[PDB]
Amino acid sequence: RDADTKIWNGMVGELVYGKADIAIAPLTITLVREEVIDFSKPFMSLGIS
């Protein structure tokens, strides 16, 4: 989310504005993203390594 404009850009901003129906992407689950859209249960685990 661009902070002052409060617009979502990218794959989530495509899911927010109704252009796309689903995203199967390397899209990490984040609290700022969870407020605006839905997520499935995660399918793959990753951490700082």
Binding site: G10, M11, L15, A20, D21, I22, A23, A25, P26
Partner: peptide, 10 residues
């Protein structure tokens, strides 16, 4: 048709 949006990354 269900729209899949993805980003290009290997």
């Amino acid at each position: 048709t269900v729209v899949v949006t993805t980003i290009l990354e290997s």
